[PDB]
């Protein structure tokens, strides 16, 4: 019963005829603040105390990614997974945004200050 | 009489099966079941592996 509503519906059904496109959607991220030498992480693994912004971080999540600033270029490396996420002195299932937390990535990886850890999702 | 009655009932069941029309070919049945002889025979008793 509305002209622009009908136009929007027509545009939606015209766009829906195009084939699917894969979009990497990032749910949340954290910015590294300090990095500590962790014994349990491994010789090549370093723990990181960092502040998480724009959403919470799930330790049980599967797909993670690392972003490093090179030069205002942002390169992406280490599509892996979080090994041990702990806040204060106790393990946590998830940490909400704004709260500082300590993260340890798997595969014995170490990251410096300024790194950005991002949890993402692939879907059609 | 028991056997004759059983045969008559089987003939009636064939007449009823005639309702389904022509039967499909082999590959439908062949792909219907992925069961193997192992799962078929384990129901009664587990046979030892050959030596």
């Amino acid at each position: 019963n509305v002209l622009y509503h009908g136009l929007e519906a027509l545009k939606e059904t015209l766009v829906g005829a195009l084939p699917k496109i894969t979009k990497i959607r990032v749910t949340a991220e954290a910015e590294c603040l300090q990095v500590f030498r962790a014994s349990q992480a491994g010789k090549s693994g370093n723990a990181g105390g960092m502040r998480v912004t724009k959403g919470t971080i799930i330790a049980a999540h599967l797909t993670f990614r690392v972003c490093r600033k090179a030069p205002g270029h942002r390169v992406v490396v280490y599509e892996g997974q979080i090994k041990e996420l702990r806040r204060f002195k106790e393990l946590v299932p998830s940490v909400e945004l704004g709260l500082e937390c300590g993260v340890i990535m798997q595969d014995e990886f170490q990251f410096r200050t300024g790194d950005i850890l991002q949890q993402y999702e692939t879907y059609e | 009489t028991q056997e004759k009655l059983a045969a008559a009932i089987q003939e009636h069941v064939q007449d009823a099966y005639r309702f389904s029309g022509p039967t499909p070919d082999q590959p439908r049945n062949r792909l219907a079941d992925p069961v193997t002889f192992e799962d078929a025979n384990n129901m009664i008793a587990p046979n030892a592996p050959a030596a």
Partner: protein, 520 residues
């Protein structure tokens, strides 16, 4: 026989709502005032959302910024030019009105126009009521009906509350599909039918055990509100915990699947193990979806020319008698194995937000200033609340008469502030401050009725609704035998009728005035 003025919750959804009541000039003027206020402040067309309820809507660009929503002046009216382009897209599959951030303003506007229709036609008076209350959004609606908040301000207030809820959900890592609500009925759950008190005790034990068993992961489950004495409890959580709770609330699962004699802890352990087994096997998530739409084809090659352009019959009786593929809730064979299946005791809800949950503590803290800077300063609030003047307002949290100067009410509100959900787990990494508690402490140290009211309003955003206690206090303490509940769909008047009060049971006559005005 004193009427209790009850307001429906945000759960009600209708395209029509109260469009037919705009024929009265006064109701039309009020509706135009509210719609113009909302359009000038955020470019949102409530009339369009109600009458059309589209799937895609365009509002003012950069009008959904959380910083501006939080720090803007609620009382001040926006003077945005009508030529401002509307480039912000809001899209929902079911409809725009399904979105909470816009559902709340529409529901509040419908309540206001219905009340205005009653007042103009029948001379209905709110002051005749001796107690006023509402479910969730009904609290704000009741305050606006009293007059402490003008409708123009209140529409913006509820829109900002909804926007903060949406921001909290977006900040939550779990997607919108991972947040579901269910209504549980322990009586039909056959959990100690002899004692409904033991039934609700077993329900609480079940949810606590599930929360403890799943505290390692990000799964959560907690009781959100208590609607009926033993017939309706609304709880939210992730699909895994909800399926575990559904399996617990199933006599067959407790009979043959595990035990028939085992303790509640063993039952919960078997339930979570079975849920994990279902995940391993591949049971579909959210199986409560409806069947496939009516099939009409036009490809004669695949189905024949005689079947083209015609709907296929759903069996010999056209679906009148459901088949085994549609009675999955009775045959626990496939698509009904998971606990998410509707079974008349574990009812799904269409709402996709964990209202009154631990996930909304941050939203509550951000929303406290929003109601702090929206109330009148010190005159009308104190006149209304003080000693108290009828109608008395009941709060969702620890439902009691709002008596800010009473030590008993102060202790009840402090217990509500410092309380916790039944299945809540505040481990490390969970947002937790005490801004509302400190605000109420300041409101107890110095009078600050406005600050106390703001704190108690903000608390219910992330604290459970004690509607059972509200009903008990309305019937017994305030001597109410009649309920005038305004709702398009009779959301809570049905529960009011269903529940029985023992005082020889007091008779409660309840009605929806805009819907059954003839009976009034």
């Amino acid at each position: 026989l004193q009427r209790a003025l009850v307001f429906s919750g945000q759960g009600a959804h209708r395209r029509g709502m109260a469009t037919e009541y705009l024929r009265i000039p006064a109701v039309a003027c009020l509706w135009e005032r509210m719609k113009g206020s909302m359009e000038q402040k955020y470019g949102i067309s409530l009339q369009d959302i109600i009458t059309e309820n589209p799937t895609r809507l365009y509002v003012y660009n950069d009008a959904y910024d959380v910083a501006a929503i939080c720090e803007r002046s609620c009382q001040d009216g926006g003077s945005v030019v009508e030529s401002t382009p509307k480039q912000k897209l809001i899209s929902h599959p079911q409809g725009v009105l399904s979105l909470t951030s816009l559902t709340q303003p529409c529901m509040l506007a419908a309540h206001m126009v219905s009340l205005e229709y009653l007042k103009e036609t029948r001379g209905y008076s709110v002051e005749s009521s001796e107690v006023i209350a509402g479910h969730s959004l009904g609290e704000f609606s009741a305050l606006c009906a009293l007059g402490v908040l003008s409708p123009e301000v209140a529409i913006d207030l509820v829109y900002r509350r909804g926007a903060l809820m949406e921001d909290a959900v977006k900040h939550s890592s779990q997607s919108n599909e991972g947040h579901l609500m269910f209504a549980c009925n322990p009586q039909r759950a056959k959990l100690c039918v002899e004692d409904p008190d033991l039934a609700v005790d077993q329900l609480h034990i079940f949810v606590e055990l599930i929360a403890r068993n799943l505290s390692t992961t990000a799964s959560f489950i907690e009781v959100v509100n208590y609607n009926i004495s033993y017939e309706q409890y609304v709880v939210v959580g992730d699909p895994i915990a909800l399926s575990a709770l559904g399996k617990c609330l199933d006599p067959q699962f407790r009979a043959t699947s595990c035990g028939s004699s085992a303790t509640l802890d063993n039952i919960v352990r078997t339930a979570v193990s079975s849920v994990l087994q279902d995940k391993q096997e591949g049971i579909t998530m959210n199986p409560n979806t409806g069947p496939a739409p009516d099939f009409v084809t036009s490809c004669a090659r695949k189905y024949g020319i005689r079947s083209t352009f015609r709907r296929f019959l759903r069996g010999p009786d056209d679906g009148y008698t459901p088949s085994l593929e549609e009675l999955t809730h009775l045959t626990l064979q496939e698509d009904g194995r998971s606990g998410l299946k509707k079974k008349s005791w574990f009812i799904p809800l269409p709402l996709s937000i964990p209202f009154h949950s631990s996930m909304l503590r941050r939203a509550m803290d951000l929303f406290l200033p929003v109601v702090r800077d929206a109330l009148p300063d010190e005159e009308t609030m104190r006149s209304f609340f003080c000693e108290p003047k009828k109608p008395v307002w009941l709060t969702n949290l620890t439902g009691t008469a709002f008596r800010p100067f009473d030590v008993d009410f102060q202790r009840d509100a402090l217990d509500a502030m410092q309380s916790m959900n039944v299945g809540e787990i505040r481990h490390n990494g969970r947002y937790h401050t005490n801004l509302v508690e400190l605000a109420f402490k300041n409101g107890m140290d110095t009078s600050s009725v406005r600050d106390m009211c703001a704190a108690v309003l903000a608390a219910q955003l992330a604290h459970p609704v004690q509607w059972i206690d509200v009903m008990d206090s309305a019937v017994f303490q305030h001597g109410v035998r009649e309920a005038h509940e305004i709702s398009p769909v009779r959301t809570v008047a049905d529960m009011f009728k269903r529940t029985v009060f023992r005082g020889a049971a007091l008779d409660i006559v309840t009605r929806c005035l805009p819907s059954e005005e003839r009976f009034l």
